[PDB]
Amino acid sequence: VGSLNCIVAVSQNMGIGKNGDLPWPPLRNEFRYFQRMTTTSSVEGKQNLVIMGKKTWFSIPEKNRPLKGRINLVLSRELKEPPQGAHFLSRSLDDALKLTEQPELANKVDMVWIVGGSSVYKEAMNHPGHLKLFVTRIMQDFESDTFFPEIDLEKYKLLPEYPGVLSDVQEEKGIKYKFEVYEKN
Template identity: 40%
Template sequence: MKNFAVILAVDEKMGLGKGNALPWRLSRDMQRFREVTIPAAEGKLNAVVMGRRTWESLPAKFRPLPGRINVVLSAQTGLALPDGVSRAGSLDEALVLLTARADVADIFIIGGGVVFAEAVQHPACNKIYLTRIAGDFSCDVFFAPLSADFKLLRSSEEFKENSLSFQFQDFERL
């Protein structure tokens, strides 16, 4: 089974979202999300795997996320999804199906809270791309404290946008 990376943004309380939406809007962070998840080996596409609630939180005009193979995790076998978007009934099912596809380059787990919690415990998770945003956004979904298995590889400079400060950090599993 292929390894995968997790990509997420958190506030200072490790908050991820509120009311099934992102409580911030940072174009530089969205740019980083595209820069990390889109570029793929020639002739292939990367895959993004997300929970059903995160899929539903994406504005209709942004889904499926373009230039990437979209997979939605859900136990609902009858879940209606557009052509080209796959459902998987478990994280392992998604990883097996994507590993078997010759047209898939890298796999990214893109949320939300339920899926991140399982993903970072998974032995095939070898990288975390984290955006740390200063401030408390009264979130209702949280990320667990990062396990000591993950070592900080690099931190970016601090960015500022809409009076918010944030920083990108890359972690790798030891």
């Protein structure tokens, strides 16, 4: 796999989660952005793969699992088999990427998206070679118990724009946010 994508939404205090859910009220267009970015593939015959930790999997409402139109892979050191509805299970990020090149997934996976949580992001972001980080900056503090680190501008560049990503401040339910894209090579 020659590129990875991470996608995350963060509060001003770097929060991503609280009590097994998001720290903020539901932002429907932000969710639709997540859906669009992770699902969209114009390569006929293939789907994108989403990789996530176990707590992130159980944080998705059961009626939306597995995430439709995507191959869903969960990371766990304890399971077993994939949780009910998930397509695949791997014991590490390295194992997950290796799995995509084996016969079952060989001609089936287009883009790989890392969708959380904290550990999965940390390792992906240190992974050699090309990485893009799609970061939604929610422009408020929210009480949180799970966090995303400050991005190191030594390794990553904030792209001034990116095709298909809106550049202006967004607002839903009185909450302002903006879509950012970072890249390292």
